[PDB]
Design a protein around this ligand. Structure first.
Ligand code: HEM
Ligand SMILES: CC(C)(C)OC(=O)N[C@H](CN[C@H](Cc1ccccc1)C(=O)NCc1cccnc1)Cc1ccccc1
Length: 451
């Protein structure tokens, strides 16, 4: 401090920072709107200050491939530290440098195409629970709240795919497991006072409600010492060139997988049905493709799901409009030059996916939901360093292939059985949380009718 001079020195444009806040007052309309403005105001690069912390935004595809891929192990290894985390410092999304490189290795074979193929029968069963739970609301010509029935499904898939537990969390009861995973303004006060993190690190306040973490540390070792197909097993099978996964490190990845697979898989299926509700020709065209591949509502399989090319298109286009990570970020750990531009040590480099996904300069009619931009005809003209819903490089979304599968096995089973109609209480056009998450302002609600 006052570091507020640093992009004025390097000759890089940007909104002027108020002392101690940087430009965080500019986050009132949301991260996403701030980015699209600074994109149009300033060009290919710009910078702003979260409190005292310099963030340099980059939009050049080569410069992005340099950062995410070429210069990753060397310069851009870690993301921006947030806290207090406590024992979750050992989670993979959060660890740094060699403790991350190690965790990546030990957890990479779990996410293989081969491992995921053996998960398909387990992920199939809870699509059925999803249909009956949906039917009891479809036979009752009353509108349905999507994040609930999709959250109950998203939840049903995680506990089973990561620990073996088997519930119908929607109805089936206060089963000992549904409630600690329930408790999945403070995170703004970190940005002006990041010097208060180590304060909170010595005070063992956990952003993870300390209790939940106490429930699963013991619940993991209950399962650990009972058995002695799922994530906890493929992890336990690994700890039998790197020191092996400890017992609290394993609990912490189990947690990272529960966070990951829950409100992401749930919120995306929301955004996709909304798109499918308010665009009923795409709904029918997909319903057709599903019935040609799986006649008579034939149960989907691994291979049949990678077969549906329109299903992939609807998914990708929905994610282009709703890249639920909004931004990608890496901390620059050395003085470096990349594609002819100096970036000093400590800067946080940021890629505004949601800006790029909705940039007219690459996307014709970007606000329109148009799945044909991913036709095998047109899918080739898409710069993979513009469309980046799962990141890129060695730090990208490790769960990429599984989420895509899990979400697609949800849609197939549901669009075989129901058609989805707008209700008078549907928010149209849907509006994004002015807040800090990519979710709908008003929850997505729609009419469900049985085919
Ligand atoms: C629609 C679903 C999902 C989307 C869009 C998504 C997206 C992302 C993105 C953008 C990143 C950051 C990539 C980067 O930093 O360049 C990420 C990281 C990560 N994701 Fe996903 N994710 C999804 C679901 C999941 C699921 C189901 C898991 C299951 C375990 C998962 C596990 C992770 C982990 C562990 C990381 C941190 C990677 C690391 O630090 O090495 N994600 N995800
Ligand atoms: C803005 C601040 C700093 C306050 O929120 C974050 O801490 N960040 C987000 C979520 N963090 C979680 C871990 C987490 C989340 C909330 C509370 C406590 C612990 C993560 O790592 N979940 C794996 C996962 C997530 C989403 C897609 N796929 C996999 C978003 C994010 C983006 C990219 C990678 C990781 C996380």
């Amino acid at each position: 401090t006052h570091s507020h001079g640093l992009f004025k020195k390097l000759g890089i444009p940007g909104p002027t920072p108020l002392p101690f806040l940087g430009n965080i007052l500019s986050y009132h309309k949301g991260f996403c709107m701030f980015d699209m403005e600074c994109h149009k105001k300033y060009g290919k690069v710009w910078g702003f200050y979260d409190g005292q912390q310099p963030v340099l935004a980059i939009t050049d595809p080569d410069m992005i491939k340099t950062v995410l891929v070429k210069e990753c192990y060397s310069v851009f290894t870690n993301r921006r530290p947030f806290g207090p985390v406590g024992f979750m410092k050992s989670a993979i999304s959060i660890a740094e440098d060699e403790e991350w490189k190690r965790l990546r290795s030990l957890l990479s074979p779990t996410f293989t195409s081969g491992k995921l193929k053996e998960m398909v029968p387990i992920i199939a069963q809870y699509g059925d629970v999803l249909v009956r739970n949906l039917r009891r609301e479809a036979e009752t010509g009353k509108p349905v709240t999507l994040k609930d029935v999709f959250g109950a499904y998203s939840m049903d898939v995680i506990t089973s795919t990561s620990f073996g537990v088997n519930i119908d969390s929607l109805n089936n009861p206060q089963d000992p497991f549904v409630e600690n995973t329930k408790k999945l303004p403070f995170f703004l006060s970190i940005t002006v006072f990041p010097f208060l993190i180590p304060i909170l690190e010595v005070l063992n306040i956990c952003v993870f409600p300390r209790e939940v973490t106490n429930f699963l540390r013991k619940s993991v070792k209950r399962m650990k010492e009972s058995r002695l197909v799922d994530f906890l097993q493929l992890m336990i099978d690994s700890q039998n060139s790197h020191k092996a996964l400890s017992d609290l490190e394993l609990v912490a990845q189990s947690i990272i997988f529960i966070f990951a697979g829950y409100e992401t898989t749930s919120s995306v299926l929301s955004f996709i049905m909304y798109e499918l509700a308010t665009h009923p020709d795409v709904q029918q065209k997909l319903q057709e493709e599903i019935d040609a591949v799986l006649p008579n509502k034939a149960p989907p399989t691994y291979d049949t799901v990678l077969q549906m090319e329109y299903l992939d298109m609807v998914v990708n286009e929905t994610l282009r409009l709703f890249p639920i990570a909004m931004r990608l970020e890496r901390v620059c750990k050395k003085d470096v030059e990349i594609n002819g531009m100096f970036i000093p040590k400590g800067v946080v480099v940021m890629i505004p996916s949601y800006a790029l996904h909705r940039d007219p300069k690459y996307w014709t009619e970007p606000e329109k939901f148009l799945p044909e931009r991913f036709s095998k005809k047109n899918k080739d003209n898409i710069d993979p360093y513009i469309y980046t819903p799962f990141g890129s490089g060695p730090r990208n979304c490790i769960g990429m292939r599984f989420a895509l599968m899990n979400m697609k096995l949800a849609l197939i089973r549901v669009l075989q059985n129901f058609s989805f109609k707008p209700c008078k209480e549907t928010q149209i056009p849907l509006k994004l949380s002015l807040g800090g998450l990519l979710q709908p302002e008003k929850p997505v609600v729609l009419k469900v009718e049985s085919r």
